[PDB]
Amino acid sequence: TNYPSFGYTLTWSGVLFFNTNDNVYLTYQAQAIGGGGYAVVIEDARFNAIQLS
Amino acid sequence: ATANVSPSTADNTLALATTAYVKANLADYATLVSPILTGDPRAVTTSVTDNDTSIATTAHVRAFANSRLAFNAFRGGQQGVPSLNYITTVCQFTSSAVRSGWGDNF
Amino acid sequence: ATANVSPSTADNTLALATTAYVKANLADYATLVSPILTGDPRAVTTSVTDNDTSIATTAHVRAFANSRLAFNAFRGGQQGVPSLNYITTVCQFTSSAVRSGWGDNFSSNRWLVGQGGTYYVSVTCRFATTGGTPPTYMDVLLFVGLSPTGVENFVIRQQTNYPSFGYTLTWSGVLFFNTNDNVYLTYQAQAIGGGGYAVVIEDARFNAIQLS
Amino acid sequence: ATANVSPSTADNTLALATTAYVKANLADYATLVSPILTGDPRAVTTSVTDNDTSIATTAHVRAFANSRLAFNAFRGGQQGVPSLNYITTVCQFTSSAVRSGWGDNFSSNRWLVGQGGTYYVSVTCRFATTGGTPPTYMDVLLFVGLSPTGVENFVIRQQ
Amino acid sequence: DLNGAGLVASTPTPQNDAYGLVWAGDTFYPPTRKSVYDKIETLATKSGAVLTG
Amino acid sequence: MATSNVVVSRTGTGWTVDVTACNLLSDTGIKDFIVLHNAIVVSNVTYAKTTATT
Numbered sequence: 001t002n003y004p005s006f007g008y009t010l011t012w013s014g015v016l017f018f019n020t021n022d023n024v025y026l027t028y029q030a031q032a033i034g035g036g037g038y039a040v041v042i043e044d045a046r047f048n049a050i051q052l053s
Numbered sequence: 054a055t056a057n058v059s060p061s062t063a064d065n066t067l068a069l070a071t072t073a074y075v076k077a078n079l080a081d082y083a084t085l086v087s088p089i090l091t092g093d094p095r096a097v098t099t100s101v102t103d104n105d106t107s108i109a110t111t112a113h114v115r116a117f118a119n120s121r122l123a124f125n126a127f128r129g130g131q132q133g134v135p136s137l138n139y140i141t142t143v144c145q146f147t148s149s150a151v152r153s154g155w156g157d158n159f
Numbered sequence: 160a161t162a163n164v165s166p167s168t169a170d171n172t173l174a175l176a177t178t179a180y181v182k183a184n185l186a187d188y189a190t191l192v193s194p195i196l197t198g199d200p201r202a203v204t205t206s207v208t209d210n211d212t213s214i215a216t217t218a219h220v221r222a223f224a225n226s227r228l229a230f231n232a233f234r235g236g237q238q239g240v241p242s243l244n245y246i247t248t249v250c251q252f253t254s255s256a257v258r259s260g261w262g263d264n265f266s267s268n269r270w271l272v273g274q275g276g277t278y279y280v281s282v283t284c285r286f287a288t289t290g291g292t293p294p295t296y297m298d299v300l301l302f303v304g305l306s307p308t309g310v311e312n313f314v315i316r317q318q319t320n321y322p323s324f325g326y327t328l329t330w331s332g333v334l335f336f337n338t339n340d341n342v343y344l345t346y347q348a349q350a351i352g353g354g355g356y357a358v359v360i361e362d363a364r365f366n367a368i369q370l371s
Numbered sequence: 372a373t374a375n376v377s378p379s380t381a382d383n384t385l386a387l388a389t390t391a392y393v394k395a396n397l398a399d400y401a402t403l404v405s406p407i408l409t410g411d412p413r414a415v416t417t418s419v420t421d422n423d424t425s426i427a428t429t430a431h432v433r434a435f436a437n438s439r440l441a442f443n444a445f446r447g448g449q450q451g452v453p454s455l456n457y458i459t460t461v462c463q464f465t466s467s468a469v470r471s472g473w474g475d476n477f478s479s480n481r482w483l484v485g486q487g488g489t490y491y492v493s494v495t496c497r498f499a500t501t502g503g504t505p506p507t508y509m510d511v512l513l514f515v516g517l518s519p520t521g522v523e524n525f526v527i528r529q530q
Numbered sequence: 531d532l533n534g535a536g537l538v539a540s541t542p543t544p545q546n547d548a549y550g551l552v553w554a555g556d557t558f559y560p561p562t563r564k565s566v567y568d569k570i571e572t573l574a575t576k577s578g579a580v581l582t583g
Numbered sequence: 584m585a586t587s588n589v590v591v592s593r594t595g596t597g598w599t600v601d602v603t604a605c606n607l608l609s610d611t612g613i614k615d616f617i618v619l620h621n622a623i624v625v626s627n628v629t630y631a632k633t634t635a636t637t
Contacts, residue, residue: 009316
C-alpha cells in the first residue's frame with residue numbers, strides 16, 4: 001500500500017497439507033518506507049482450518 | 054410325519070408349534086442377507102471418530118459433518134510489530150476454539 | 160421330553176416343528192444385538208433435518224452433505240452508491256438461493272438464519288467509478304451486520320489510487336450466528352479527487368457454509 | 372389344542388418346540404419394522420457414489436466427506452506471461468490431485484468436472500516482474516472460464 | 531421377458547469422439563467401438579503389411 | 584401363455600385376488616406366483632390358492 005495511515009488488510013483462503021502432531025504457526029513480515037514516529041500494528045486476526053481429508 | 058392343526062400366528066401359548074406357524078412368524082423378521090427395514094429403524098450412535106463397518110446413524114452423520122471445522126482462532130485489538138527488515142514474526146491470538154475428540158489443540 | 164424327527168428347514172406344512180428345526184431356521188436371521196449385515200441391506204431415508212439415533216442411508220448422507228450451503232446470493236450489474244463519507248449502505252442482490260427444510264431465507268438485502276451455529280462466509284464486492292474525472296483515492300470498508308446499519312463483524316477495508324478501472328474486495332472466514340438472525344452485508348465508501356463521477360457496486364457474491 | 376410343557380429357550384434338541392418357546396426365541400431377533408439395534412450393528416460398506424436407500428456405514432460417511440474436495444491444483448515455481456494488453460491467457464499447473472471414483476480429472480491446465488452442481492472455488496496467484504526496469508503500473512484481471520479464452524466468471528481485478 | 535432377468539448397474543457412457551489428446555487422461559470412460567475401429571484401420575500389421583505414402 | 588402382473592391396491596387381510604391376467608398354471612398345488620407388497624418381495628405361503636383364476 002501507499003496509504004498506511006488507513007492501512008491494508010491481507011486475506012487468503014486455500015488448501016494445505018499437514019501431518020499429525022505438526023505445529024502450525026501464522027507468521028508475517030512487514031516493511032515500512034518513509035514517515036517517522038509511527039508504530040505498525042496488526043489487528044482483526046482470523047486463522048482457521050476446515051478438514052478436507 | 055406327525056401333523057397338527059396350525060395355531061394362529063398371534064398365539065403365545067403352550068400349544069405345539071408347526072412349521073407353517075414358524076414360517077409365518079419368521080416372515081415378519083429381517084433376514085441376515087439384504088433386508089429391507091421399514092418404518093423407523095434405530096441403531097446405536099457410535100463414536101464420531103469411528104471408521105469401520107458399524108452402522109452410521111443420523112446423529113453420527115451430523116457429528117461427523119459439523120466436526121469438519123478443525124479450529125478457528127480470532128484476535129481482536131492491536132499487536133505491535135516487533136521488528137522490520139523482513140524478520141518473521143508469529144501472530145498471537147486472544148481467543149480460539151478447536152474440535153473435541155481428535156487431539157487437536159490451539 | 161417328547162421328541163420327533165426334525166423336519167427339513169424348508170418344510171412349511173402342518174408337520175410338527177422341533178427345537179433343532181427352529182434353531183436351524185432362526186440361524187439365518189439377525190439379532191437385536193450386534194448383527195453383521197451382509198449383501199445389500201436397505202433402510203428408510205429419513206428427513207435431512209433428522210438428528211436422532213435412526214439409521215442414516217446413503218441418500219440421506221448425500222442430501223445432508225449437499226445441504227451444507229446455507230445460502231448463496233449473486234448480483235450482476237451496477238448499483239450506485241447513494242452516499243460517500245463512510246456512510247453504511249446495505250448491499251442489495253438480484254438473485255439468491257437457500258437450502259430447503261432448515262428455515263433459512265434470503266430477502267432482497269438480508270439473510271434469515273434458519274439454524275444458528277458456525278458458518279463459513281465469503282464476501283466479494285467490486286467498486287468502480289463511472290463518468291467524469293475518476294477520483295485520485297478510493298477507500299472501502301466492509302462489514303457483516305445484524306442490522307442495516309450494523310458494523311458487528313468488520314471483514315476488510317482496502318484503498319486504491321485507480322478507481323476508474325475498479326477493484327474488488329474479497330474475504331472469507333468463520334463467523335458465529337444464532338437462530339433467526341438477520342445478516343446484512345454493509346459497505347462504506349470514501350472517494351477523494353476527480354469530479355462528475357458515480358461509484359458503482361457490481362459482481363456481488365454473498366454465501367455461507369454451515370460448519371456447526 | 373394339543374399342548375406340551377414348554378422347553379427352555381436354549382434347547383436345540385429333537386424335542387417338540389412349543390408356541391411360547393418359538394415366541395421367546397423370536398423376541399431376541401430384530402423385526403422388519405423399526406428394529407432397535409444395539410451392541411455393534413454392522414453392514415456392508417458401499418461405494419462412495421452410492422445414492423440409494425442402502426445403509427451407509429461410518430467408513431462410507433468418512434469417505435464421502437473426504438471426497439468433497441473435487442480437485443486441487445498447485446503450481447510452485449515461475450512462468451512469464453506470453454502477452455500483455457488484457458489478452459486472456461490460461462495459467463498452467465505443475466502438481467495436482469483429484470478425487471477418485473467421481474470422474475473428476477485435471478491435466479496440466481484444465482479441470483474436467485465429473486458431476487455438475489454447486490462448487491466452492493478458490494484461486495490464488497502472484498504476479499511480479501523480473502529483469503529490467505520495473506514498470507510504474509500494472510493492472511490484473513482473473514477469470515474462470517469454459518474455454519481457452521473463457522470469460523464466463525470474472526472474479527477479481529487489482530492494480 | 532415381462533419382468534426381467536436382472537438389474538444392469540450404471541456405467542459411464544462411452545464417448546465416440548476421436549482418437550487424440552482427449553484420450554490421454556481419461557481413467558473413467560471406455561472408448562467407443564466405432565472410434566477404436568476408426569483409429570485401428572490406419573495402422574500397419576506385423577505380417578504382410580502394405581505400407582503406403 | 585402370456586402373463587401380466589396384476590397390481591391391486593388393498594388394505595387388511597382376508598380377501599381374494601383376481602389373477603386371470605397372470606395366467607397361472609391350472610394345477611392348484613403348484614403355487615407359481617410371487618407376492619410383491621409395496622415393491623418389496625414377501626412370502627407367498629400366506630396366499631392360499633383355490634382356483635387358478637382366484
